[PDB]
Amino acid sequence: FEGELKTLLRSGKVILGTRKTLKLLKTGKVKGVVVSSTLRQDLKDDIMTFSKFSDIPIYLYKGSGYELGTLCGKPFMVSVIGIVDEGESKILEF
Amino acid sequence: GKKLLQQRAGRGGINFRSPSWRRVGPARYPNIEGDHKGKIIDILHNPGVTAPVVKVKLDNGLQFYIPAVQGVAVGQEISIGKNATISNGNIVEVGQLPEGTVICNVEKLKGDGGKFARAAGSYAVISGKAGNKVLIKLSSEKIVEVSQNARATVGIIAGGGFVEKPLLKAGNNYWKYRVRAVKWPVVRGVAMNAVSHPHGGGLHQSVSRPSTVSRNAPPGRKVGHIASRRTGRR
């Protein structure tokens, strides 16, 4: 799993921050979004509600923003991740 | 002579009632007949309780208060009744419980509100199943019997490690009972005048009589070691 992700950060385009991806996702212009378990529940439904409006695959992450951000490498946590380019990884099928 | 200090509390004067208006309310189980689901909306402190409480809204629109149970939060949902599972904070009946289950605030008879394991830090354990009722042990290692449909809550009431922190100061002790009707500070009697204490009087402060007395002893005279099984540090 992590190897697949580590490839995306290497070259594939990524989006960090809910506001941008949530702005973007409603327009149906994202390859995929992965969310850690630590998302505030007020937004989780909206993602799930907006998930079916253009059928964008979503992976649920059991982790928090930290390990997601630790894998992301940013010192601070990331609640969600936005993708507009899979690049060369093999994640989208998930 | 003039009656005892314990005697004085028998009058039911001001010096012995509690200002429960400063308290949140009577926290006993509200009466329900079936199965219902509720959500926690608030937690407040209750002065003379030594344990936090919870305000919970009922799915049918009722307000009530129960001792707060460990690891439960605002907005979490609690189901109450027969169908409810074994989850922290859910209120169920003993008829569905397995052996060795950890619960608190056990109800004695159906619709009473719970009378045992309602303080802080304690818990209730199950030691068996009787012909018509259930075997329950409180922290005092004794056993009590309650009805089949008697209610209970799975979990532990908050307040663990309560007395580890030293009082360190009579001021703390003074504001620990500022609302509870305990007479504070407690005054010993052996130094008091004999006019108002059975063991009062005497220049050399000494025990006047063997403190142990027979069971038929009249009230106001039973003092000190009362019905002691044994003495000594060991």
């Binding site: 630590t38 946590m77 | 939060a73 908050a158 663990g160 360190l168």
Partner: protein, 65 residues
């Protein structure tokens, strides 16, 4: 000995040491079970805790979450 002395030289060190050890656990940085250890939680009163991010009141122990 730090916090152990904030009352001066009173009441006995042995008492102070006991009051010492427990107190730090209250101020030792914890991990919010709801949002995360990101912010720090506070003990308003025995059993009362919430950090300033989750805004989730919950039941704690007398001095620990």
């Amino acid at each position: 000995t730090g916090i152990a002395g904030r009352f001066g030289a009173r009441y006995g060190s042995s008492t102070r040491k006991k009051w010492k050890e427990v107190m730090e656990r209250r101020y030792m940085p914890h991990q919010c079970p709801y949002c995360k250890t990101t912010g720090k939680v506070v003990r308003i009163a025995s059993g009362i805790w919430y950090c300033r991010k989750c805004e989730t009141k919950w039941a704690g122990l007398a001095y620990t979450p």
